[PDB]
Amino acid sequence: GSLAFLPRKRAARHRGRVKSFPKDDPKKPVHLTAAMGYKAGMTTIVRDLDRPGAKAHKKEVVEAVTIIDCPPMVVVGLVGYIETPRGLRSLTTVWAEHLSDEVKRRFYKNWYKSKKKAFTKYAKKYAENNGASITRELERIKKYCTVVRVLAHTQIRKTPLKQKKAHLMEIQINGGSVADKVEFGRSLFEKPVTIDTIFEKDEMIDVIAVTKGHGFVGVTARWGTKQWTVARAGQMGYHHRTSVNHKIYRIGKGDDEANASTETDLTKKKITPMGGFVRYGEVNNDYVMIKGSVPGVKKRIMTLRKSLFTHTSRKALEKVELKWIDTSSEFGHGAFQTAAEKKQFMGTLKKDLQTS
């Protein structure tokens, strides 16, 4: 096996941390870096390839893509860091007024029995002429910090998940003066940020998630067998992984009602498979169609971040043209893309006449 992933222990957290944001210079415009989504499943697409020099040039190729449900994130805070001889240090963070119930659920282990008063005194700071305190923290970030990050949380009431406790993370603000990005973060308070604004089509991203667990496994399946360097039994899976160079093929809007339609096939259909995504449900929000496979089980929190370096391949900066998107059922050997297509093929049934 590989000694670069040697401490094969369970991840300390279920969310997964970025661990590196792309290097910042003030010349680029102000932008965000990362976002969160929920893994929905996989589907098959047909792509009109435009790869000069390849055997499949000017031909149709069938590829596997993964769907990540991406409801808009709400910006509810701002954090500032300073450079020290001991690394980066958090100087102060400025929260927004009027936090939602979901983001407060993250702060509690027993939300149902609690007297929900998180940030109750902090809200009075805004509205009781202690706005000097809020501005003093904002000015402190401007004149002392070198990196400013945004606290954004998901909206899982839109996600078909039984979990009600949202997910917080810090997203770095890159490309600008420290003063410019602080005004950027304050203006984003209490506001939803959509995925098509953070990323876009035919760009290559990195995804961070915790892998599927397998429990106690022996040497045959853990280390791949035909001291610290000797294969042993232990935990396999549930490991933090950072996969890079995954191309976004499509960003769906959710309100389009024709998300899975292309310029080639004129079928008004959404991305959700016939009968729903197996073990997940229906994607009713913005979604990111990522090529290939991505670490994590279905309905697992998914961390999307930008590439740390400018790309060196023609796989990037190449246009992606879609011909057809599969929507047939994943619960079996499906053969119908729409409910209408099934009824047209089989005619009318005994129950159809009895009801009518």
| Interface pick for RNA out of 19, 23, 55, 351 (rule CB under 7 A) | 351
H or E stretch at 215: strand 215-217
Site for RNA contains 162 (CB under 7 A): yes
| Interface pick for RNA out of 38, 199, 280, 324 (rule CB under 7 A) | 280
Neighbour count for residue 37 (Cβ, 10 Å): 26
Question: For the chain, where are the alpha helices, taking DSSP H only?
Answer: 101-105, 120-127, 131-144, 178-187, 195-198, 219-222, 339-346, 350-355
| Residue 330 labelled as part of a binding site | yes
Which string of DSSP letters, residue by residue, matches 288-327? EEEES--SS-TT-EEEEE--SS---SSSTT----EEEE--
81 contacts 91 by C-beta, under 8 angstroms: yes
Closest contact distance (angstroms) between CB of 331 and RNA is 4
Q: Residue type at 265? A: D
| Interface pick for RNA out of 278, 307, 321, 323 (rule CB under 7 A) | 278
Beta bridge partners of 45: 63, 325
Closest contact distance (angstroms) between CB of 345 and RNA is 6
Site for RNA contains 342 (CB under 7 A): yes
Closest contact distance (angstroms) between CB of 163 and RNA is 9
H or E stretch at 153: strand 147-153
Please, which of residues 302-331 interact with RNA by CB under 7 A? 328-329, 331
Closest contact distance (angstroms) between CB of 168 and RNA is 22
Please, which of residues 106-125 interact with RNA by CB under 7 A? 113
Nearest Cα to Cα of residue 293 among 240, 239, 245: 245
Site for RNA contains 282 (CB under 7 A): yes
Closest contact distance (angstroms) between CB of 217 and RNA is 9
Q: Residue type at 108? A: Y
| Interface pick for RNA out of 19, 117, 143, 350 (rule CB under 7 A) | 350
Site for RNA contains 349 (CB under 7 A): yes
Annotated binding site: 330
Q: Which positions lie near RNA, rule CB under 7 A?
A: 113, 160, 162, 216, 220-221, 226, 232-234, 274-282, 328-329, 331-336, 339, 342, 345-351
**Residue ranges at the known binding site for Mg(2+):** 330
